[PDB]
Structure 1
Amino acid sequence: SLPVPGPDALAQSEALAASLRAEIASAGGWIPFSRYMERVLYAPGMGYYSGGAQKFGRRADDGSDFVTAPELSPLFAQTLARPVAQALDASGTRRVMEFGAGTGKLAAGLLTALAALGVELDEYAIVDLSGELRARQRETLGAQAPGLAARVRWLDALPERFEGVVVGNEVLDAMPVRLVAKQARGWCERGVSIDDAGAFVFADRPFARAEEAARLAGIDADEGYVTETHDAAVAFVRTVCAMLARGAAFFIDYGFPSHEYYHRQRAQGTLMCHYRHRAHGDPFVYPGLQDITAHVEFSAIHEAGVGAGADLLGYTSQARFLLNAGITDVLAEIDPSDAQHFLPAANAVQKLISEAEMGELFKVIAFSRGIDGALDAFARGDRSHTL
């Protein structure tokens, strides 16, 4: 069912795989799933995300693996600019920092939409783990925001403090997770080993310490339940919120609060892989050539940000956030008689806000420091009390 990679791509994946087999052997034959993801997704040079921009796009026939809101439509960035601007104003700051900037479309769109709102930034900082997307980002910015691109900086390291607005779209979902599985007796960790034939397989091990099972005790799990823990995303949000001195941080991503994430019925968890616009469950397929994600558990994200000293600014579905922020007014700026522009825009809005598409599954959580009031983008249907 999955497309076969070309022979040159298979050679890269094979080299990654062979090194990882050797690593698992040297480790004693078992590694946590988080280390497996760390390698296949983020190995320097060889990881899926240590690579260029082809993976981002709209359709299989452009060579991409998955679509994201910035790739889908400029109306996403144009809408997001409204709460970003309000947060800059409320906090008295003048910089934006984006993590995981992809092709640069979100940055170019935010810059041009912020300018149209009368907001000039001192800096738009792009934070990626390595530098392989810098050339495509520069190209996008030159093509789509030519008179504003000069304000962009690609950081090699985070500042100790930051005053401004942080953005990350589909960044939290991409972070390594550990897998846990319910036994007859308590819970264990599901990791990765290598079978007799040299294939990657799941394999279970006990936890080293009892705190580890006790944090899962509240899950109403039957034997066989398997789900994900999200320490990496928690650590990242703490880093962001400890760095933030004044301003806000917005994370847009698919997921749920804890009571929904770890619901009795969600017994297979949320782990999914994306390859050439096919979603499937096998993270051992073509290592380095496909993504592996889990949904975001927003209660733990909330606790992470607030625990590092930030305030919760809001939490709601992407539909409510974008509607509150003015996406319907953004669409109304386009003349309905201009069919070439209007129909694709209306279609993308539908995808961004419909519960059958992105609108309910995707959520937006925000943190702040030095913001006393509420953002308009959270003024209706905020779900903070459910976290």
Structure 2
Amino acid sequence: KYPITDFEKYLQDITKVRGPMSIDTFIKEVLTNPKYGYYMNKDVFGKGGDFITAPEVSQLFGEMIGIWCVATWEAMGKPKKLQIVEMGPGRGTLMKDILRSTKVFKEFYDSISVHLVEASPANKKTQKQNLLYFKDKAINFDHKTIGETPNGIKVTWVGKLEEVPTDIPTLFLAQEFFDALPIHVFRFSREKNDWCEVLVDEDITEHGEYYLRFVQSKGPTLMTTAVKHLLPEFGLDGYQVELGLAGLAISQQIANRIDKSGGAALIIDYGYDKIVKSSLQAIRDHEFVDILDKPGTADLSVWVDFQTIRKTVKLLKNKSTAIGPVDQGIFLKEMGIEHRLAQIGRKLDSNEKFEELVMGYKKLVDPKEMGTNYKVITICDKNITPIGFSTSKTYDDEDL
């Protein structure tokens, strides 16, 4: 035990009036609740911005994504206006590396504007500070939703993808974004020959462990019935799956935007080319903890189901398709990262700086590091061949 937090008391109250809550609802509350959220007001973590992401590991990573943006823009017929959208830019490191490294491509750089989709006002402020040129001392970061980069590239912040202008060809970047979206969890009961949903209820049992607990819905919930067509047909008892419905909805918005106005999305994340049975994890001060251990104090994440993203896009039966996933290591090698590593290394004379650069390269591409756990998938037009996906597989059962 420990004594009951105010956020736990509040979540218990929801279960008393509304019944046990879906894991989707729980993840939204735990992250984004105004008063007790993790993503909204955590404050003062260990080290400087929480965790090791790929942009912060190497400039190599952002330069390669930059090359992908330019090559894809070329493959689209070099449109005079191109939007670049990023989902959850973090501190803005990725965007900064892209905008730095793609300045040399004059024709490309003259066509771009940037749109960052960001819900957190804290991250918004950090991104603005990281990306913008400022002419005034007093900056209120909330009335500043449009800005200019020091190279004069326009950057606009919006809360949701829906708010991004339509009818312009668009690149979409989602880097470690889908792993932080809510999921639902379902499990099959042979005792009721059907799927149940896994819910979070209050835990007042005589020797429970925490103040919340996982329960199985009595029958199928309305969500179970609504998504039955996405679940396995194989009813094995206790078989459990995670479904990233929030992410599937975003995948459809991107696919449909691309069908209408052209474009391409690059989704990079840790995950699998199959249904993910169990992956929801809670990390607090760099230690794995239980999900229901003081909720709101720990960062929740999931491993991404790339397969269901792919099938969902394909099921739209429009001009869009999804190709991949391919491993991050293979993707980046195919983009020319080894050549760039050597070029950057030759300009450096330090050896200490070169050793650091090579380790960052190894962290990105080695199979024991991020090389295989991290994967890349593209949502794009059927008729424009994607860049960096030559090793993508063919999925016969899903192409008629």
Identify the TM-score tier after normalising by the shorter chain: 0.7 to 0.9
CA distance in structure 2 between the aligned counterparts of 1:124 and 1:54, rounded to whole angstroms: 29
- After TM superposition, the structure 1 stretch with the greater mean CA deviation from structure 2, 284-293 or 153-162, is 153-162
Residue 35 of structure 1: aligned partner: 25
Are 1:252 and 2:268 matched, yes or no?
yes
Deviations 1:164-200 (A, max 9, x none): 2110001111111111223343432111001117701
Residue 221 of structure 2: aligned partner: 208
Deviation at 1:41? 1.3
One-letter amino acid of the counterpart of residue 239, structure 1: Q
Q: 1:289 to 1:63 in 2, by over 3 A?
A: farther
User: Is the CA contact 1:353–1:359 (under 8 Å) kept in the aligned structure 2?
Assistant: yes
Deviation at 1:16? 3.1
Q: 1:254 to 1:160 in 2, by over 3 A?
A: same
Structure 1 residues not aligned, in runs of 5+ = 5-9
Q: 1:86 to 1:110 in 2, by over 3 A?
A: same
Residue 237 of structure 1: aligned partner: 251
User: Is the CA contact 1:188–1:213 (under 8 Å) kept in the aligned structure 2?
Assistant: no
CA distance in structure 2 between the aligned counterparts of 1:148 and 1:287, rounded to whole angstroms: 43
CA distance in structure 2 between the aligned counterparts of 1:45 and 1:123, rounded to whole angstroms: 35
Paired residue secondary structure (1:250): strand
CA distance in structure 2 between the aligned counterparts of 1:122 and 1:352, rounded to whole angstroms: 27
CA distance in structure 2 between the aligned counterparts of 1:158 and 1:333, rounded to whole angstroms: 37
CA distance in structure 2 between the aligned counterparts of 1:329 and 1:54, rounded to whole angstroms: 39
Residue 49 of structure 1: aligned partner: 39
Deviation at 1:142? 4.5
Residue 132 of structure 1: aligned partner: 122
Deviations 1:215-253 (A, max 9, x none): 4344574x4343311211111111222233211011001
Residue 302 of structure 2: aligned partner: 294
Residue 140 of structure 2: aligned partner: none
User: Is the CA contact 1:98–1:126 (under 8 Å) kept in the aligned structure 2?
Assistant: yes
Residue 69 of structure 1: aligned partner: 54
Paired residue secondary structure (2:238): coil
Q: 1:220 to 1:203 in 2, by over 3 A?
A: closer
One-letter amino acid of the counterpart of residue 280, structure 2: L
- Residue number among 162, 165, 188 corresponding to 1:159 in the alignment: 165
Aligned length: 359
- After TM superposition, the structure 1 stretch with the greater mean CA deviation from structure 2, 74-83 or 337-346, is 337-346
One-letter amino acid of the counterpart of residue 238, structure 2: G
Deviation at 1:340? 3.2
- Name the % identity: 23
Map residues 167-178 of structure 1 onto 2, 5 A cutoff. Answer: 167-178=173-184
Residue 7 of structure 1: aligned partner: none
Q: 1:25 to 1:159 in 2, by over 3 A?
A: farther
User: Is the CA contact 1:54–1:64 (under 8 Å) kept in the aligned structure 2?
Assistant: no
Deviations 1:48-104 (A, max 9, x none): 22348966xxxx5x1544321122222111111111111122223422110101001
User: Is the CA contact 2:33–2:40 (under 8 Å) kept in the aligned structure 1?
Assistant: yes
When normalised by structure 1's length, the TM-score is: 0.83
One-letter amino acid of the counterpart of residue 163, structure 1: P
- Residue number among 329, 338, 341 corresponding to 1:328 in the alignment: 338
Residue 79 of structure 1: aligned partner: 64
CA distance in structure 1 between the aligned counterparts of 2:86 and 2:232, rounded to whole angstroms: 36
Q: Which has the larger radius of gyration?
A: 2
Residue 136 of structure 2: aligned partner: none
Are 1:147 and 2:147 matched, yes or no?
no
Deviation at 1:153? 1.2
Paired residue secondary structure (1:359): coil
Are 1:102 and 2:90 matched, yes or no?
yes
Q: 1:53 to 1:83 in 2, by over 3 A?
A: farther
CA distance in structure 2 between the aligned counterparts of 1:106 and 1:236, rounded to whole angstroms: 20
When normalised by structure 2's length, the TM-score is: 0.81
- Residue number among 379, 385, 388 corresponding to 1:377 in the alignment: 388
Deviation at 1:359? 0.8
CA distance in structure 2 between the aligned counterparts of 1:319 and 1:247, rounded to whole angstroms: 24
Paired residue secondary structure (1:283): coil
Deviation at 1:208? 3.1
User: Is the CA contact 1:170–1:254 (under 8 Å) kept in the aligned structure 2?
Assistant: yes
Residue 360 of structure 1: aligned partner: 372
Deviation at 1:326? 1.1
Q: 1:36 to 1:296 in 2, by over 3 A?
A: same
User: Is the CA contact 2:190–2:235 (under 8 Å) kept in the aligned structure 1?
Assistant: no
Residue 90 of structure 1: aligned partner: 75
User: Is the CA contact 2:268–2:374 (under 8 Å) kept in the aligned structure 1?
Assistant: yes
Deviation at 1:207? 1.1
Structure 2 residues not aligned, in runs of 5+ = 134-147
Q: 1:220 to 1:109 in 2, by over 3 A?
A: farther
- Residue number among 339, 358, 362 corresponding to 1:350 in the alignment: 362
CA distance in structure 1 between the aligned counterparts of 2:394 and 2:97, rounded to whole angstroms: 28
CA distance in structure 1 between the aligned counterparts of 2:96 and 2:35, rounded to whole angstroms: 26
User: Is the CA contact 1:272–1:294 (under 8 Å) kept in the aligned structure 2?
Assistant: yes
Deviation at 1:297? 1.1
Residue 142 of structure 2: aligned partner: none
Deviation at 1:154? 0.8
CA distance in structure 1 between the aligned counterparts of 2:149 and 2:231, rounded to whole angstroms: 50
